[PDB]
Design an enzyme around this catalytic site. Structure first.
Site, PDB file in Angstrom:
ATOM      1  N   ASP A   1      38.080  40.717  42.421  1.00  0.00           N
ATOM      2  CA  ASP A   1      38.293  39.280  42.300  1.00  0.00           C
ATOM      3  C   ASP A   1      36.952  38.605  42.013  1.00  0.00           C
ATOM      4  OD1 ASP A   1      40.486  36.907  44.069  1.00  0.00           O
ATOM      5  OD2 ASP A   1      39.567  36.800  42.107  1.00  0.00           O
ATOM      6  N   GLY A   2      36.997  37.456  41.350  1.00  0.00           N
ATOM      7  CA  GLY A   2      35.779  36.687  41.103  1.00  0.00           C
ATOM      8  C   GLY A   2      36.136  35.206  41.113  1.00  0.00           C
TER       9      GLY A   2
ATOM     10  N   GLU B   1      35.474  36.853  37.225  1.00  0.00           N
ATOM     11  CA  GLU B   1      36.651  37.732  37.227  1.00  0.00           C
ATOM     12  C   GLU B   1      36.386  38.981  36.397  1.00  0.00           C
ATOM     13  OE1 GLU B   1      39.160  33.628  37.345  1.00  0.00           O
ATOM     14  OE2 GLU B   1      39.927  35.131  35.970  1.00  0.00           O
TER      15      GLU B   1
ATOM     16  N   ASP C   1      44.232  39.958  40.183  1.00  0.00           N
ATOM     17  CA  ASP C   1      45.117  38.831  39.928  1.00  0.00           C
ATOM     18  C   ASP C   1      44.580  37.916  38.833  1.00  0.00           C
ATOM     19  OD1 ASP C   1      43.092  37.369  41.056  1.00  0.00           O
ATOM     20  OD2 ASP C   1      44.270  36.559  42.712  1.00  0.00           O
TER      21      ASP C   1
ATOM     22  N   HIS D   1      48.224  36.486  47.016  1.00  0.00           N
ATOM     23  CA  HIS D   1      47.579  37.293  48.041  1.00  0.00           C
ATOM     24  C   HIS D   1      48.574  37.951  48.988  1.00  0.00           C
ATOM     25  CE1 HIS D   1      43.331  35.260  47.777  1.00  0.00           C
ATOM     26  NE2 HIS D   1      43.462  36.270  46.933  1.00  0.00           N
TER      27      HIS D   1
ATOM     28  N   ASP E   1      38.665  38.541  47.287  1.00  0.00           N
ATOM     29  CA  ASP E   1      38.489  37.092  47.152  1.00  0.00           C
ATOM     30  C   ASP E   1      37.545  36.549  48.216  1.00  0.00           C
ATOM     31  OD1 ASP E   1      39.248  34.431  46.033  1.00  0.00           O
ATOM     32  OD2 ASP E   1      40.284  34.201  47.958  1.00  0.00           O
TER      33      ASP E   1
END
EC number: 3.1.26.4
Length: 152
Positions: A8-9, A46, A68, A122, A132
């Site tokens: 995640d980013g 991301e 995601d 999530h 995250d």
């Protein structure tokens, strides 16, 4: 002997402080990667999360990469094959946005057999939630310069 990766980013501006989180699990154990940048974007973080996780693989592997990110999903499933046909330029002949990271991601990928898992929320995805949390903590205390970030 698969490798499970969860990435995640995020960033706090457009451009602002940002960070990434990546979790790698292999033969029972886990490794974690996270770093923050002073001026970057959500989409660049991301992408960076997936790049860093794949660059950590020191031998060819069977990978299950869970993210995601809509941006990563669109690049992988819709855009990259056509960008390569066009020499990494859009119709107006400008370089594709974030071409530096897309090309670095393509180099990090192509040595592995990757099954992408495009997750939505999530709920039911604890490692993505933790990735995250790592990205957000890194964005709140950034140390690196995202040298490839360019306005617009």
């Amino acid at each position: 002997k698969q490798v499970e990766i969860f990435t995640d980013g995020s960033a706090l501006g457009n451009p602002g402080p940002g960070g990434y989180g990546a979790i790698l699990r292999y033969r029972g154990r886990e490794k974690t990667f996270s770093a923050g940048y002073t001026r970057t974007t959500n989409n660049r973080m991301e992408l960076m999360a997936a790049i860093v996780a794949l660059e950590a693989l020191k031998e060819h592997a069977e990978v299950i990469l869970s993210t995601d990110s809509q941006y990563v999903r669109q690049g992988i499933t819709q855009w990259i094959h056509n960008w390569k046909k066009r020499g990494w330029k859009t119709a107006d002949k400008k370089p594709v946005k974030n071409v530096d990271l897309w090309q670095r991601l393509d180099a990090a990928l192509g040595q592995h057999q990757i099954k992408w898992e495009w997750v939505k929320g999530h709920a039911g995805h604890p490692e993505n939630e933790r990735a995250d949390e790592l990205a957000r903590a890194a964005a709140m205390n950034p140390t690196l310069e995202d040298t490839g970030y360019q306005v617009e």
